[model samples]
Target: GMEDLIPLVNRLQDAFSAIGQNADLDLPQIAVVGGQSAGKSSVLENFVGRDFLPRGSGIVTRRPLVLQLVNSTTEYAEFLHCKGKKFTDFEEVRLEIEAETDRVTGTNKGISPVPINLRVYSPHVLNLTLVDLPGMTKVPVGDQPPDIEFQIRDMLMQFVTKENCLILAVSPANSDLANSDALKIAKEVDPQGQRTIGVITKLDLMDEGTDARDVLENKLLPLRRGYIGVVNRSQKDIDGKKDITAALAAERKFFLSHPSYRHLADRMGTPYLQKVLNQQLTNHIRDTLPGLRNKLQSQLLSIEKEVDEYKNFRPDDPARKTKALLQMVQQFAVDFEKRIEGLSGGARINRIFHERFPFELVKMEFDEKELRREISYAIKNIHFTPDLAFEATVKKQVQKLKEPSIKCVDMVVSELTSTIRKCSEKLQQYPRLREEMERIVTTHIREREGRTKEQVMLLIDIELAYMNTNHEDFIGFILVIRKGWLTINNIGIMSKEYWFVLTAENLSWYKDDEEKEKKYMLSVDNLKLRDVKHIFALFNTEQRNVYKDYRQLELACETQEEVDSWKASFLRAGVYPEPQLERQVETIRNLVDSYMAIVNKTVRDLMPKTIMHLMINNTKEFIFSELLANLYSCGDQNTLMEESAEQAQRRDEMLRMYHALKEALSIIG
Candidate 1:
């Protein structure tokens, strides 16, 4: 079926479909209508020479079809179910039609003025525009459609409302002309006898002695255009797969050679009838043109009404609307760029690069107290060898400085959050403008929040990467501490010089500019850490011998006396140790904690330098730089256009209405 309509009328399908819209205008075309079994399939098949239309159980076309026979002296084409949408492929079209039927007829079989259009393109064959549907024979099946006859009746009435379109009703001549449903349906639509043609099919299937001569003539019933009797393909012939062209020629031969039908053969069969249909269709268009203009003007209001009254939209200039929407897109881009440029003043009120950035960088220098504190950390309890603790200590302390380093970045304010409110927030702007802004802003905020959190994460990730204390700024500190390699329990020898601090009083330093660390760092008690397995070479051997001797004496005694004697034993007696152990360590091995302690010249000094001076401190410019790069990089920012479902549906409804009006205007003109 998709291949048959191309020769002439299919062009009509293309014209309307190019902007096919909401409601029907005075679109002039034929709707091939017939009852359930009016041999309509066979007839349509004969015309198109393709078995493309679906033949299934029950009815599916609850939706009336708009079959557009397009000219494909080029190629066969498609059809639509709703407005400009089309459905093809055998089962897809048939079943969708069934469901749409429910939409149109529902509980009561009624008709919809909005027709579903389908176009089939043909090259040079069929030139006529046609619908070969059968008249409904009475029957009842399911949910009430105003009866099959009524559905048929309404579809015909709706389609033929424009009088110039031809209606060639198909009826079987095998039955009495009185019973020809196609002719009867034709009469009701064209009661005055204008613009109707009659087709009489199945002439060869008449009864043994029942000639169709009288029925074919006016004896049984009559029509202004009269009738032409045509033979139908038998089930065998169709199964035999006889080609349509041969069938066409054979039928023509039958009409001419039939003894009783010879005289009227010239007026019989598919060729002559096909020509008749083409001629009538062309004639109708030419006849209808003058009236079509008035048809559109009168039709515009009615057509527009079908899709109007949508909840969220109203009549407005489409150009203005499209402009407003696009302007929003550009404005969005500008606003996004502002945050990075430092031009939005809760922050910088100027430009980027040298203007605001360099001024924002944090200084690398640390103050006196800070310097001492950092130096002390590297000095405490470190090794005496040429490598180890002091160097790593300085490095560790520097790495631990992230807190102090990042603190300055938050000092400045940003308009980031509070700048703009909704349009309705105007005097509050337009009353509904706020609503519009709320929705738009909500979409933007959701997206911005997701991306900005990533920026936060990225800031943390990059900062952590530099946490390694090996940064060049700490190299000097590392070199200085390289000699302080200490291992567990390695007490070696104390330095010859004594580190003394006043016993129990504070040193006001008499002056503020003193070695603030002198008192505690060089203090007597503070100079020592618990020693393990530490022995002086002089006393160690003798101490062991004394303990061994004392233990022998204890074993020689018994009971409580043995325990008592253990006091003189070295290991067994608590008191048998080095004399004046306090006095001994207090001797001028005068190793102060500060002397062995690392002076963290590297980590302490570099913490500030690394994070503040070169890195975190300059983050103001980093923020500015990054913002500019990322802002300008967005070409697809507006492409996402995450529209709310309601807006999308509303816009579509609105567009179709306007499009319908526009399409009607074209049709009329």
Candidate 2:
């Protein structure tokens, strides 16, 4: 019944891998270790009674080989890497190992710590698991990594140091026992030789005058399991396609008849060694079983703890997935809102408008030095102060304002990028979502950047078109509602707000204060005003009809001050009522200076208003909603929030590990 122990351990191992680097459960197994030319492969093949290991001159086992032997009626082999295929012909098993090895480590002379697990079933063998690691290379070969010696040692130490592993050190009989690489390492880990089994190979290759009588008899160097001697097939027999059965028969004959080994020959051959190894492993498992069960119990509980937390990550529920996505998107929106709306960030825009924009204006210096020369020329040549002279001078200086205005747009764009980048941290686990959100929000700001620049440039252009010298800050600006009528009914239609500016030439109305789009111009010459409740109308002087149709236009002044000002300004600019001084040169010079000052203050007031409503406020108001829109705009919202492949696989793999370990614990009981 205890003979089932190694196979039980094998079942646990195969249920959930205990062989790879990722193996967390330390289970007992025999680790076959040797130098580059110690005939390690030949020893393992003898145990399986088949020549199934890949053979080469240099570092033949490039990766660890966890070879499991099971006694089965059908002689076949399978690799964990390809579970779908079987190898009834053991030759194909050798080919698959080489191919699988090259696939991971490549054709170059290098090694991987990952293992290739091969399970061989044959009636000739007892149950055992042997992990064959890369041979310890004492010296480098052509194009090999120079530190292969250290690397192989590092690889070997990982296995041999484990208290659960049984070190099977294979040493060639011809090599000096004092200098044996395998024994030297085994002694380091298994200092008491408690878990090491020494195997002496290539006994026939020893010098004719010498033998390993002392080594094989546990006299030269000692271990708990001592040593077993075996003579593998010679290269001549192997090249001639000699059967492993014939090699075993020859090994038996050589050992039984040899003078030094004859007495111990029956207990010294491959068959005896394989049986002894199986017994050693069976006892190792029985001893380690209680501890193994405890480890499995704790590991399963730990995995279940993690698996419990990942319950929210279940992919089955679309409603919960969508809810999660909405929450993430909403969080980003609120974070972006807080970023732009907060004092730390929004203050910069305020500072840009109030302090920086005005400071940029002062730095421009107003062209006062050039003003005297231009004003004197204008008075002497063009007489009575042409508007074009003021317009031309202000236009040159005003266009420079575009630089800082666009700079303001750029600054805000940068702040927005910073906020979105910070906000994207919540989605860090979803790389695609983070990158795509950054792309969408940043591109949205960049898009607003261009429009903000265009409107800023247009704001400057409107200021250059006319000089309202009477601005309340030299009399300021205006708001008026235009009267509309129907052609068929002649009924008064809805009045729309338009900014009206009265000048000596015409009374002009624009769609917006900043837009400055002059939809129509009415000459003030033939219009007369009538007032009611601070409301005034401009009527055709020639229209004699008593009906109210005679009133050409009507305007409502919101306050008494507005009414009084509009009336007085209308009288001066109108023909109905009639509307500079200084040194001939100095008078005109100071007048131009006052007009430029008016232009500065007026633009200072309006440029910020233009930028605020058009860009900053616009971005703040819509960014959150726009970000939410993106949640639905794309066809596959699920794809945006899908878990990464590595993340999903790890969780699912851990779940599988939990189930496997549970079954293994049950199998042990």
Candidate 3:
């Protein structure tokens, strides 16, 4: 069938054992099983065409020997412990096995579940991995641990119970089939004998009248994978150093000469046994690799995730340690600098300063019509120039500049704060250091932010503190409707109260607040407002040059306030003197306009400058020293750099697992 599958699994077995813990990885394997004196060692040696197994009185193979048979161009054996030293002499291979077994188990007939891995490469052999476990013993041998028998059984169950393991149960042909310990134990684990291969060894030793014909034919104590009989080198033949090739020839001749096995001769010897084992194992691996690959990939994925969180730290001398710490601190500063300065990264601060803050300034509420209305009201009441009202209005607008200025501070501060975290991202691998660094840097930034906001507010306040009305050119409204009631002399030349409503076009006197009751309409174009004592007098200027209907119209008021109030209305409605109010209003508007432009530009330029000095530059220049002082000078370097023990161990374990899984997958694939 698939002969190459054996070596693939052999490589996988080597990979798993190389990492030294295959206890959890249930890889498919052929585990040889037999009781003491069951010719299991002899059968294995016959497969290798060598007499390499240790010959003994009792319990010769103490530990499990993971024998990986690789078909190579040359013949040699190598032990996992004594690696790079090939045992070309088959005798040395035998000696090395005994020496290695004693190295672990000591000079006693004791058993250890630890396996001695041996790889045998020969041009004559087929690739296979057979785990040769200690022979099943019912009692402990001399100088052996009392629990040796229990230990052996315990160890046998450990390998056989794995669903991936194929049981090679060897029984002597002379032994009763019902009393065979190997088959009894294999049946316990594999009740259906699905994965068990029964090998009836020492076939020629059977009594002359009896033979294992029925068992070999699957008629008695039948296994799913039926038994095969092979004749091993007898005790005398082994003592005389008889070759396995001659032994195999004798085995085939014996099977062919016997009448019961003559028909089954080709299928009864060691060659057929090796071929069947190889094909069965190949089929087993074919069925097993898909699931094993899935396990390997999934487990590797899990290890990758776990190892991702672990920080990689190397053993460092003091100079290297100091240099790493210094470089880390410097790198943080460089990252922050890069971010703010827009070197291969975002220039968030540049946008905050130039684009966002200026937009906020441009978006401030400025209404020209409202300013016109306010200026006219001030001029009408104050009886002076518009400079005072202009200064007050301009200052109100300038004070509002504080809001956006302070907001600019907050925004740039926010940018720099997040920059701290961004810069600290690399440090996050070292949890303690990153945590401490973030805390220190954040504290420093917040303190600087406090000073920055204060400075921004101060800049705004300074702009408000002095309104420079004397800037270059020194420069830089809805209806004129003055309506009210007044006292007028109507014929009696006495005081009489009359309602007068004035507009831009004319002055109409209404009896009440309504529009329809009109007594007289005066064309203010020719009228004049004259204040005489506590009285209002309207004189016709046209009467001086041409004939008119009335010479004068006079009104008397009880209080001085009414006289002045009535006087103001006619004055505003172009009565006595229209003192170029539009020109004056424009002048005031221009003055405030010029003043606000100055303040806006001042705050706009000054806010970033203040932020640059107090927040950005301060942090950039001193952040390294701040961190060094808070973290390095006062803190433990090793403690800060150190990872937790659990984390280190988990990382190491996951790394080892990752490499082993990768190796195993490569081998199997």
Candidate 4:
């Protein structure tokens, strides 16, 4: 028996590898669809030979579940964690089902159920697996809903092979079997007239002489056409010779009269059933099965190829082909820099428009608008009549007055002289301001460096706590390390907090107990004196050393500006600079030119590398989006997030139903 299954296991492994590579590989999927009180859970329990699932009426099977059979003896199970943040690892197939039934029933009693994941196994089936999907008619978790059908379809698309996979659709053998939803899903999963099997369950529940078979046949014929089948084995049929057709008919009529069954029949028509089956079932199976089979075959090759591909998939892999792409990006940056540099002259011209004309017009325009408003207001409030005599008197007085001739030559001279003096002082103080600014910036950088090390320590503590609390759930947390100037917002436990305090020593004042009880509690006072000493040392030694180099260059530029001003003055006096001054200017010019070239080249080279880095960084976000989309399609919010105890209890019952349905579907693959 084991030997016979080895080929099937091998094929499964191959299929998994192939689909895993494409990242969007499709596999065969089988979903269980039925209505309330249809014995969906009972059928699944009987098939799996386990009572792990809950059974009852009023809508169970609230979430979709995907099951896979593994050869390893180790028993493993986990929830999909659709909203919690993580990607589904497809390398090893595992079973996962949502707990949504809790949410559906909770709604009637006003409660919500927290999201949950459930898993289990059966040793009987090796080659195939099963899926218990939420009943289509009564979806739970409507708000914050998961893409239950899509999640089911995706799992099936990834694991099941259309040719090898089978859909065992269970519908009640009563008049309710004519449900449009049941027929629709059945047609979708078994589209192309293959790989689908139907089972008419609960024939014993019907009345005597009911035409259950005819009712079922009529409902399924439009969808299954030529591929319809059934398994009508009930408890009554176990010991006695019961007429399957009559039993099924009786059950069908009984279900048609039931309130719950009637509700499903009323809301669910042929169109709704056909749409779900066609879009989710038929389309998915038709599109994914062939591709999945091919992928499985491809994964069975040499281990070396597998290893090589896996290594290449790494974000930081040295053998990555994106190096050329990076180079292209760098070239683009260089071109961009050149274009910007070319616009410098135009930018200067634009500045003249904004500064020269606008400044020149400002005083005149301000006086015009302001004086006009003031004169208008004064004239309006005056006790003057609107008679012809009053108008004539005002006009004569206005015409007799001489227009004011405003002399601005002295004003311009004084302003120019003040500007020149300010410029002169600025030129003289340039070296000092540059030094002071450099000192402040350098101090901040040093503090940041020290704080970053402390931040790293804090991060380690947080990670350790997470690992200790939930070791099994830990995948790995990412720590980003980069060399750059930290901004104000970047300041946390990881960056400099000097803006909030003058020195590390002063930080203690903010962290006092009284303040700690208030809204903005401070943390600095709690730090040991040694922490302060360490921070200061790191700032003075490491940060100051690096910053001094940058400071020297800035000072040199300031010196150049001063020297150019002096040279202009001397030229006005018809005198040239001394040889020493000339030599200094030439040296500064060459230094600036060389620095600019290096800066240009460095920017150019960094472009492509940045793009590749970003792809790796954003992988988690991409995976999160995909998983959330799937969950939204499958789960209902009311059932998933039950609040009150009564609703909670109802939700639990529904979850049991979903659990049973999952177990049933797990057997089909």
lDDT by residue for model 1 over 288-335, one digit each (tens)?
Answer: 645765665555565455455432232234534434334443454354
Clash count, candidate 1:
27
TM-score of each prediction: 0.42, 0.68, 0.49, 0.32
Q: State each model's CA lDDT, in order.
A: 0.45, 0.74, 0.77, 0.35
* 1 versus 3: better lDDT goes to: 3
Clashes of each: 27, 7, 3, 60
**The candidate that achieves the highest lDDT relative to the unseen native structure:** 3
lDDT of 4: 0.35
lDDT of 2 by residue, 317-394 (tens): 655676766777777777767766665666676677788877777776656556666555555666425555555555
Superposed on all Cα atoms, model 2 deviates from the true structure by an RMSD in Å of 22.6
Top-down lDDT ranking: 3, 2, 1, 4
Q: Top TM-score: which candidate number?
A: 2
lDDT of 3 at 278: 79
